Design a binder for this molecule. Structure first.
Ligand SMILES: *[C@@H]1O[C@H](CO)[C@@H](O[C@@H]2O[C@H](CO)[C@@H](O)[C@H](O)[C@H]2NC(C)=O)[C@H](O)[C@H]1NC(C)=O
Ligand SMILES: *[C@@H]1O[C@H](CO)[C@@H](O[C@@H]2O[C@H](CO)[C@@H](O)[C@H](O)[C@H]2NC(C)=O)[C@H](O)[C@H]1NC(C)=O
Ligand SMILES: *[C@@H]1O[C@H](CO)[C@@H](O)[C@H](O)[C@H]1NC(C)=O
Ligand SMILES: *[C@@H]1O[C@H](CO)[C@@H](O)[C@H](O)[C@H]1NC(C)=O
Ligand SMILES: *[C@@H]1O[C@H](CO)[C@@H](O)[C@H](O)[C@H]1NC(C)=O
Ligand SMILES: *[C@@H]1O[C@H](CO)[C@@H](O)[C@H](O)[C@H]1NC(C)=O
Ligand SMILES: *[C@@H]1O[C@H](CO)[C@@H](O)[C@H](O)[C@H]1NC(C)=O
Ligand SMILES: *[C@@H]1O[C@H](CO)[C@@H](O)[C@H](O)[C@H]1NC(C)=O
Ligand SMILES: *[C@@H]1O[C@H](CO)[C@@H](O)[C@H](O)[C@H]1NC(C)=O
Lengths: 361, 254, 120, 50, 50, 49
């Protein structure tokens, strides 16, 4: 009270000095069920992968994508992102994802990179300089390799011009190494552009077949259908907690509600447009949001020339939520309630007054 | 496959009164015993709505401008109206949205379709005739859902294209009136929001033929247009919109 | 509950103190107004149990003993006809004590004339 | 952005407190009139017309 | 630019409305006094000095 | 008549409604003041000729 009044002596009376707050104890985040997962099992772990001149493009959209399972897998020998962060893939949202799957040689795994120049980069699969997304690659010597040699995986060796980014070329035109005329007829200086790899189990690391999946993100004006997973916590009721329900945040006491919502409605508002009712997204139940018991802290004292004894009034606060007496004005602590009636010395409110004789109410 | 329908009877389109129809819930918020004023694309009260017939020989499937939104009212028996045609140029140059309800399920596709000039379905007296498209080249979105569906049923629909979101509001109402729109109040609940992200400026209703040439089953539908205005909506104790006030209709409601 | 907002609000100084002090002055002014209007007597008078006033009837303005609020029928009808950091402070005088003050004023002006307003 | 919200809400609160002070002055004038009528019409007989 | 002009003109209009409310309260007090003088001096003879 | 100005002014809420309400209250208060001062009789008395 001396701090509030900016004086070392306090006259007899009641002085509103502070504001009691019921401090929030927990944080409750309830987010709906993580269903309709993106089909990453049929892209990363498919039956047969494609070649690099005809890389398979899978469009990932209208689903929720769990990148934590993909990132925590230890089978992947290369996980390099060029426009995003691996630990923020579960937090960001994108419009759609392009998944480019192919098989290359182990020495060409570095060639799927922005600014990298190679045969696969120039003629088979090209990335832009402002590429966003992540390149994932893992060894597949136990699956793709054959003891007679796996010749099914082809790759383009010759082309007149370099690729544009995200451009396919499945054409089988005979390249002209020299200046001799070739009408599709092979000769001394005219060779077929697609050659087969030599994947065998006796080769060391670098010639083993590597399966590469490249995820590319688009951030156009289309809505961001692809988002990360939502980790909803448990629901705690009857306590002043910080609630976060489907992006609607606040602080309140969450109690059971008798308001029967219609099934399309999620939140509830009173006359004054404050959220007092809500539906939990996990379990379809209706909860009332009572605001925490904020109150005004008033100090009831006589003069400091008389005595240093004080009483504290918490306005509009029940006495179980803070010489303790319950009034209609609030909870009064430090005053002894008596049955006698006197004239009003210090007004408390609702017919209650305080006086000094100790402090009585 | 496309077929020109050349046995139509020429007749100008009709017009009738909207009364107090076309109201929908502006948001997902419950409100109890309160009056809420909201600014959104709403259908004007007592407005001039376009009335189309299907009777035998009338078969009204034209292409109309979408404007800022479409209120679709359907006085339906024996399920003649099956879907709608959404796009801008209605050919393979642009990307179009298809809503169909055939004999099994509802299919929602966003693809590059080649629409026929006269698209329809057909029931043989059994549905064994699908002539609504000739091709489907580049699809970006597919969504299979639960089926939405004297005139016995009344079907109200509101279609809005706001920020790439396609809002479908709907309400089923049991009526027993013969010819025109009944007079009453029914707020349309939000059913499904579609992430389409496409330009739509023109639309066309999809009907179904009855075969036994062709015969048009008895149906009538109504098209209204959404305009930006203010409604004062009344929420009852149970939280449903039971009455509304159009703030720009007359000075009393103002 | 935003601490950054309060840290930015401390740059504006004592505006909140002035608003709280003005509202506190209004709140104590309402109680002072009720005190000046109704508490004009320091003696709580009662009517006699026998209502023999020479034919004059005051039952519609005297308090009804059958009602728990101890209001007059006219006062009961008057009370029936009237229907984020925000707090409502209760008034210092309750409606029962304001009714008691009006009952004392009515008993004084019925039993004692204007003499109780000028002395005993 | 928070500074914009702060100055808007502070302007709203100052407007509310100002109109509350004006209404408090009006109610205080009415209550002073009511106390005058309590003193002069109830506690005595007044010669003042109307 | 319109945000600066809007907050300046809104502050000017709020100042004008506040001054008009204070002057209206003063004129209401003067009119209540004038109605009291009409009741007590014109419609009757007043014993109140001056 | 600038519609962009009114669109930006709607972001500030119901200040304009408050000011119009206060001015309307003052405007009807002036008529109430004249009614209280001058209309103290319901009979229009006339002097003799
Ligand atoms: C149904 O009628 C329409 C309208 O005439 C036909 O559309 C036209 O078909 C001719 C065929 O040579 C084209 O040259 C026109 O360009 C078409 N019109 C437009 C606006 O594109 C349609 O082909 C007819 N259906 C069938 C199956 O013949
Ligand atoms: C004073 O007035 C009251 C109310 O007008 C009278 O009470 C009524 O008495 C009659 C006959 O006994 C009843 O039929 C009414 O129902 C009473 N009204 C109420 C409101 O109680 C009362 O009789 C009058 N006289 C005295 C001496 O009290
Ligand atoms: C194959 O990859 C998918 C990627 O989603 C993963 O879910 C699955 O568990 C993998 N299969 C095995 C056998 O690990
Ligand atoms: C969502 O998950 C919860 C988890 O217990 C389950 O009870 C519920 O049935 C699921 N579905 C819906 C629609 O809530
Ligand atoms: C509706 O429009 C048509 C032509 O567009 C017009 O003839 C008719 O009178 C209109 N209806 C009303 C009620 O104005
Ligand atoms: C949508 O299409 C219409 C006509 O087809 C055109 O005028 C308009 O500019 C288009 N909008 C966009 C955003 O492309
Ligand atoms: C309805 O349409 C879907 C999708 O085009 C199709 O799979 C299904 O067979 C159709 N139903 C009938 C009865 O043809
Ligand atoms: C659209 O389809 C045409 C023909 O089917 C094809 O040439 C073109 O590449 C496709 N475009 C996209 C973006 O899929
Ligand atoms: C609200 O629902 C109750 C049933 O719980 C019903 O009795 C009442 O009539 C309904 N009110 C309205 C206005 O429809």
């Amino acid at each position: 009270t001396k701090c509030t009044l900016k004086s070392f002596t306090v006259e007899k009376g009641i002085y509103q000095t502070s504001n009691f707050r019921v401090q929030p104890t927990e944080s409750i985040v309830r987010f709906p069920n993580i269903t309709n997962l993106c089909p990453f099992g049929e892209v990363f772990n498919a039956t047969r992968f494609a070649s690099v001149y005809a890389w398979n493009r899978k469009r990932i959209s209208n689903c929720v994508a769990d990148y934590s399972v993909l990132y925590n897998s230890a089978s992947f020998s290369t996980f390099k992102c060029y426009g995003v962060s691996p630990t923020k893939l579960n937090d960001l949202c994108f419009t759609n994802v392009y998944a480019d799957s192919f098989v290359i040689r182990g020495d060409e795994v570095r060639q799927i990179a922005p600014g990298q120049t190679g045969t696969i980069a120039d003629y088979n699969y090209k990335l832009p300089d402002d590429f966003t997304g992540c390149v994932i690659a893992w060894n597949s010597n136990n699956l793709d390799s054959k003891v007679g040699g796996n010749y099914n995986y082809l790759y383009r060796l010759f082309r007149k011009s370099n690729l544009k980014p995200f451009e396919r070329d499945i054409s089988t035109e005979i390249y002209q190494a020299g200046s001799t005329p070739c009408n599709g007829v092979k000769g001394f200086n005219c060779y077929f552009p697609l050659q087969s790899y030599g994947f065998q189990p006796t080769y060391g690391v670098g010639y083993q077949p590597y399966r590469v999946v490249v995820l590319s993100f688009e951030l156009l004006h289309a809505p961001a259908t692809v988002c990360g997973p939502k980790k909803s916590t448990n629901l705690v009721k009857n306590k002043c907690v910080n609630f976060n329900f489907n992006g609607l945040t606040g602080t309140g006491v969450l109690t059971e509600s008798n308001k029967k919502f219609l099934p399309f409605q999620q939140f509830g508002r009173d006359i004054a447009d404050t959220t007092d009712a809500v539906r939990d997204p996990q379990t379809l139940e209706i909860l009332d949001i009572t605001p925490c018991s904020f109150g005004g802290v008033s100090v009831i004292t006589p003069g400091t020339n008389t005595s240093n004894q004080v009483a504290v009034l918490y306005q509009g606060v029940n006495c179980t939520e803070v010489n303790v007496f319950q009034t209609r004005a609030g909870c009064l602590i430090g005053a002894e309630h008596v049955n006698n009636s006197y004239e009003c010395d210090i007004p408390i409110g609702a017919g209650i007054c305080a006086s000094y004789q100790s402090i009585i109410a | 496959q496309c077929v020109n329908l050349t046995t139509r009877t020429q007749l100008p389109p009709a017009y009738t009164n909207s009364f107090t129809r076309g109201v929908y819930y502006p948001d997902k918020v419950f409100r109890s015993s309160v009056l809420h004023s909201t600014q959104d694309l709403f259908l004007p009260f007592f407005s001039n709505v376009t009335w189309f017939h299907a009777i035998h020989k009338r078969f009204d499937n034209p292409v109309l401008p979408f404007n800022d939104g479409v209120y679709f009212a359907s006085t339906e028996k024996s399920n003649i109206i099956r879907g709608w045609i959404f796009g801008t140029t209605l050919d393979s140059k642009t990307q179009s949205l298809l809503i169909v309800n055939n004999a099994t399920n509802v299919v929602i596709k966003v693809c590059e379709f080649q629409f026929c000039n006269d698209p329809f379905l057909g029931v043989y007296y059994m549905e064994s005739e699908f002539r609504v498209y000739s091709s489907a080249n580049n699809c970006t979105f597919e969504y299979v859902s639960q089926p939405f569906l004297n005139f016995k049923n009344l079907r109200e629909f509101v279609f809005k294209n706001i920020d790439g979101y396609f809002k479908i509001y709907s309400k089923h109402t049991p009526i027993n009136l013969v010819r025109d729109l009944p007079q009453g109040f029914s707020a349309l609940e939000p059913l499904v929001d579609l992430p389409i992200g496409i330009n739509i400026t023109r639309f066309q209703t999809l009907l179904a033929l009855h075969r036994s040439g062709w015969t048009a089953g008895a149906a009538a539908y109504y098209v209204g247009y959404l305009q930006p205005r203010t409604f004062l909506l009344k929420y009852n104790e149970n939280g449903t919109i039971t009455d509304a006030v159009d703030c720009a209709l007359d000075p009393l409601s103002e | 509950d935003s601490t950054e907002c309060s840290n930015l609000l401390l740059q504006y100084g004592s505006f909140c103190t002035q608003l709280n002090r003005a509202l506190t002055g209004i709140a104590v002014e309402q109680d002072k107004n009720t005190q000046e209007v109704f508490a004009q007597v320091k003696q709580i008078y009662k009517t006699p149990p026998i209502k023999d006033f020479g034919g004059f009837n005051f039952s519609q303005i005297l308090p009804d003993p059958s009602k728990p609020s101890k209001r007059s029928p006219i006062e009961d009808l008057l009370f029936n006809k009237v229907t984020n950091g925000l707090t409502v402070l209760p008034p210092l005088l309750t409606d029962e004590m304001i009714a008691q003050y009006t009952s004392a004023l009515l008993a004084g002006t019925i039993t004692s004339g204007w003499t109780f307003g000028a002395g005993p | 952005q928070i500074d914009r919200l702060i100055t808007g809400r502070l302007q709203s609160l100052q407007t509310y407190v100002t109109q509350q002070l004006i209404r408090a002055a009006e109610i205080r004038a009415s209550a002073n009139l009511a106390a005058t009528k309590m003193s002069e019409c109830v506690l005595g007989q007044s010669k003042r017309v109307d």
